[model samples]
Target chain A: SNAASGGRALRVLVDMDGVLADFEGGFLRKFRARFPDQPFIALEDRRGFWVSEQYGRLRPGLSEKAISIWESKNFFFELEPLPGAVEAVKEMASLQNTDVFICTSPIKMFKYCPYEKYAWVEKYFGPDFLEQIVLTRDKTVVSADLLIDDRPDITGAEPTPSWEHVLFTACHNQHLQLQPPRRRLHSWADDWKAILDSKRP
Target chain B: SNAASGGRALRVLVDMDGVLADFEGGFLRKFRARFPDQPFIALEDRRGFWVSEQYGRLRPGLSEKAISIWESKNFFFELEPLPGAVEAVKEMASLQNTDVFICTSPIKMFKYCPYEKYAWVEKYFGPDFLEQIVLTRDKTVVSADLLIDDRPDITGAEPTPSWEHVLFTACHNQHLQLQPPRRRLHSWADDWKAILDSKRP
Candidate 1:
């Protein structure tokens, strides 16, 4: 009953944070605790990529300190996996011939980001999954047939890209709409089927 | 004709230090600069894993400082690629059905280690190979058909390992003898042939 059985398994690159982990929820929770006086803003309310800018809107120079705290080991350890994400990832990994990888971009300035992220993957997805986790800034550099991420600026590479981008819907990225040829995965319920279908010859 | 043509490409995981990069040479050069009082010792003179201990023999606590300098951004940038390593890697990457990766272990405590290592790969191997680079502490966790590393303690995993460990001979590891089944790769001269042959069904 394997979806990819009897066929060449598709090499799938999946993103963490909004796609698999509830980064916004975790960050907001921590942000509230750190700055109790500031009004709690919905993730959808902010438009820019830098969460610091959003925080700066409320208070001056708070963005710098907020980023420091966000990049700390304490914040990374508290990240919670998104609903159904674990099961979805498990299912995708179960498919035959499918090489599943967690490709995440860690904050460059954060010294503990890579270690913390690795530990988080190990704690949630287990040791086997940790082996498949890749920490890098640019996802486009990675080679695969399909990439599932929740960001809009995932493209722009030289010599073309091998993997087709699949937008994983997130509150922060809901504003940017994708057109045909570029598939959009709404939730875990959509799962690997959409990704697998994209790879169908 | 491609060596791996008309077949499933073998996943080959290669080490960076002794295998591809002249880590010993770089470290010794830096060590000499830091400790001019002590007589220079050949890399083969000292045995065991910790390069710190080897340097410590020359000076009481110089090893500790030497290690710090060695792990710094400047040290990594100065690393010279092993003779024939670049050409061999290019050839292996070009081979059909061969998924080549540069698997390296950077100093955990050093903040700049990962970034410098990644940059080193990008500089030497170019951007295309940067996508294939994997930074990890434990090499055993990596899934591959063949692994070329200079270290002997590269094994120890559950359910056995899928990849066959190939000893990439270095001055430090030259003394240790390995039995059959575990092949020893002499140098870049051996190239990818031994690695490709190991993947034969």
Candidate 2:
């Protein structure tokens, strides 16, 4: 069960939303206020809201930032790891001989432009460590030993031989309904003992 | 941002957890009953009880089913998409020239025994549809115009010039803390008016 049992060290995949950046709460407010004409569904609906084929233009400044974030390799500088994210990831990297990378799914519609997405990363992780940042629409391809995310799809994907997934507590409400076994971390401040003790078959 | 403006149809990425399968709820009950030694910080703590790593042995028949699902490409059948999932995805696919594919991060631990994973795919997506499934840890690799997922990490990454992201509702607490300019679908069953209506810059 321990890493010693295997030849390879543990690799950790950390999430950016509630775990590192407060995404939902901040984006929703901005989205509704800037583009009220853009239809949005209430959170209580649980099923989900799909953007109609007729999408709206992103608010000003927002689009540029979003585009820059997506295209720039230097965007990590704008992001700040969650309160304890730096420490937690640092520990995982050091203790488990793990490689830490920023695994996130940034939706384009959430912001005015793709460049703006980098602001979050640039503010938290710093520009120097940008390479460690992996921009992914699907968090499943990294093939890390484990992943920490707030989304149900990533966490809910049936655990297979590739990687173990955890749900980082975020603003999305549907995670509350998931069955246990799916890992859920309430805060970045939580202990890493569970992670450190993790083992690969 | 409008689909017509961009000359591309709307894209919707669907998630599997609370949206497709009640994985969180189902896995928790089974985990608690089967493995009591492992302590979890939260339901999202996926690393706590990896059967391949440790956590003792699989409970009797569970291992076989897990293995079967993991090994078979057709195992997708074991999972039932969330309420209104089929209808929602179908409708999204219905959009003129729109495309939809199952994007998931299947763990590699199961790679040693692909039969189980295959079985899970076959069961969930149906035999014919299994081949269309794209399994990867990183969703960003997928160039779809839109992604529907439960984790903000996957959705919050650097947005592509053309990709839109949506987090399906799962854990509500996390949704409350998100940043800004994002959307959460209550149910996949709802229409994708928001996406379809988006305006391109």
Candidate 3:
């Protein structure tokens, strides 16, 4: 219940896709290409994800950004680190004892085969950016002391009895299907520090 | 997306709390003496047990009724099935090869625990009543094709992936907690049968 770092080290589980890189722009582009003459503007629902019959396609340069951000090895690179994120992650990683595992929902290639989504990381953030890459179809399996995800289901895991979850807001794909009286990350900057500061009592 | 019931039998999981029996009524009587002025309501926040500051004391005769209710196997007996519950359960349970499981949140006790709560079932519903008990501290473990419970969490499980869900209204609980966008058990009487009758390919 205490919120302070150094009191107890944590294994941070980070998610890729929308949180780190822009997927909606690319997704909308694809959608628009497939369904050309639909009401595209009306598609962007309150939560941000496109849902109308006139779904647009992804943006032009989203793939390059996705690859580069994957390589950065920094937790908040996709959304520009939410201010203090760079400092907080560096501090947590400096602990050296803590493991920063990346649990991403990348586009699946095949059975047990991942598309090396972070290859760009080698050039961008050096070789050893991510400790482990769990390329699973589902997120519930990757158990950690803290999970930083934009999906309300995983991030909202806290209010439920399973894990301590943190949500990073996604601009384009923001419409989260959450329970009533939803629990969410207030601000990325404060949430990162708050998590880093939380004690494991 | 088909909802046909004849060929593919429907599975129903029923809850024990407010759906099958009056949990709030049971609590009010059990703790009335302790808190004279307190109103009977659902425990808003999560704490280990019901013995919180909000629950005052045990009222006179409250204890006896609780004991009698428990002794009567009212969790299965003394049973007031929500308006159309009896017909609904019978129809579902009568389905060809349908799976029907009773999932309840009850404290585990020794077979011969010397408490009114422990012996209540056998006293009323006969010995076999004790055999069907699926008691667990957590309700998540209960899963089936369909679940009917007063709690939004339990009943709302299957609907996440489009499985059938039925929400039985509970006394003294917020109605908003059980409203749509989520699939609701239309009407206790006719609408339920209609839901099963209407199916998609």
Candidate 4:
């Protein structure tokens, strides 16, 4: 209706880190560097925010300290793009009048995280894509027609989001149980199609 | 008067980059890496946004390409704190009930600028200061009693800025001639006092 009324394109907001980039891999790599003796664990193995519980089992305070370092400029540069993320995002961008934005939450404890994330996008996605990136702690502050992210709590914010929340499946967030009206995408492939279809009049 | 009447502390918003951090220095370092033949120019020598005209005089199209690289995560990590910025911010944070926020503009073309800035604050100012960091393109969107920044145009936004804009002197911004109601701060030292006095009941 809104699209038909004005021939407007849907605004799509995508998340970085887990969605487009392999943040867990990058984080774990640095984490392993600090505590070599610790066994490497997958995101699905972790249960809470601290993450220290699962990964920090080797050293009592290792996760906290590792996280502090991981959030720094050093670790941010080491991040790699997730498979199909770049191609998917580019396709989304190619669509006519589609306002695509990369919305991400910066690790507050690390000052360089935002810059690194920006750099990562510019490096993989190019300078043009860089302009579409949005960094904020609260995703709800952004107004969009669709939001694709790996985190589940982002959909639970009060006042209900103006955009439909689409969960991007990841190792850590695979265990999440989403309710009706919310959708989960297994991969970047065909994900853009679902998003485009939703915008269809 | 607002602080007194409302029994509230004065909200002070501080800018990063030129004001609190040496963004120019970091930028030039990367510029030099890309265009070694280009003669190095100080920030004061540059008069425009392109930066290519001043610093990359010897090498055409160098600054443009250099800027894209400079805005990346690597350049942001190389940024050093301006003289006395850390101590000054700490002192301002210690002030009684003074709400101090580090409001910074993210490089619109770079996705990680905000995260790097947040990481920078957390690393230099400590974790307590991280919560106060606000990332936005438009500083006017931030509501505060005072804004300390190097740019003069921040006050010229539509609807006018509610905060008293105090220009933080820098090499590039030294030439600006400000009008009344708006003030210029030469250095971080004692500038906090001026900001605090403005909110005195």
In terms of DockQ, the best-performing candidate is 4
- Candidate 4 DockQ category? incorrect
Rank by TM-score, descending? 1, 4, 2, 3
Off by over 4 Å in 3: A1-8, A26-91, A95-97, A108-113, A155-162, A172-182, A199-201, B1-201
Model 3 agreement with the true structure over A1-201: per-residue lDDT tens digits: 212442333556566555444444544444355446543433244244323222223444434433332233322222232344435544555553355555565331111112234442233334455324433334443345667766665421112223466766665435565655444554445556556446344
Off by over 4 Å in 2: A1-7, A32-81, A108-119, A155-161, B1-201
Model 1 docking tier (incorrect/acceptable/medium/high): incorrect
What does candidate 1's lDDT look like per residue over B1-201, in tens digits? 123323445678789988888888898887778767766667768577678877688768867776776767667767899989989888888876666778787664444666667667878878656667767555544566778888886742212455788888888888887776667888988756856865766
Model 2, range A1-201, lDDT digits (tens) per residue? 113432455556677765776544444444466556655434443232222211223334444433333334423323445578766665565564455666665443322222343445444545544445554454543456677776666521212324576766654544476677767667867765575466443
Clashes of 3: 36
Candidate 3 i-RMS: 19.1
- Greater DockQ among 2 and 4 belongs to 4
Q: Across residues B118-189, which tens digit of lDDT does each residue of candidate 4 receive?
A: 667767987766666767665653456688888767721113455788888877777767677668878876
Residue B197 Cα positional deviation in candidate 2, in Å, after optimal superposition? 42
Q: What local lDDT score does residue A32 receive in model 3, on the 0 to 100 scale?
A: 51
Q: Single out the weakest 10-residue window by summed lDDT for candidate 4 chain B.
A: B1-10
What TM value does chain B of candidate 4 have?
0.86
Q: Which ten residues in a row have the lowest lDDT in candidate 1 chain B?
A: B1-10
Interface C-alpha RMSD after superposing true interface residues, each candidate, one decimal: 9.0, 16.8, 19.1, 7.7
| Candidate 3 chain A minimal-lDDT segment of 10 residues | A107-116
Which candidate number maximizes lDDT? 1
Per-candidate DockQ values are 0.07, 0.02, 0.01, 0.15
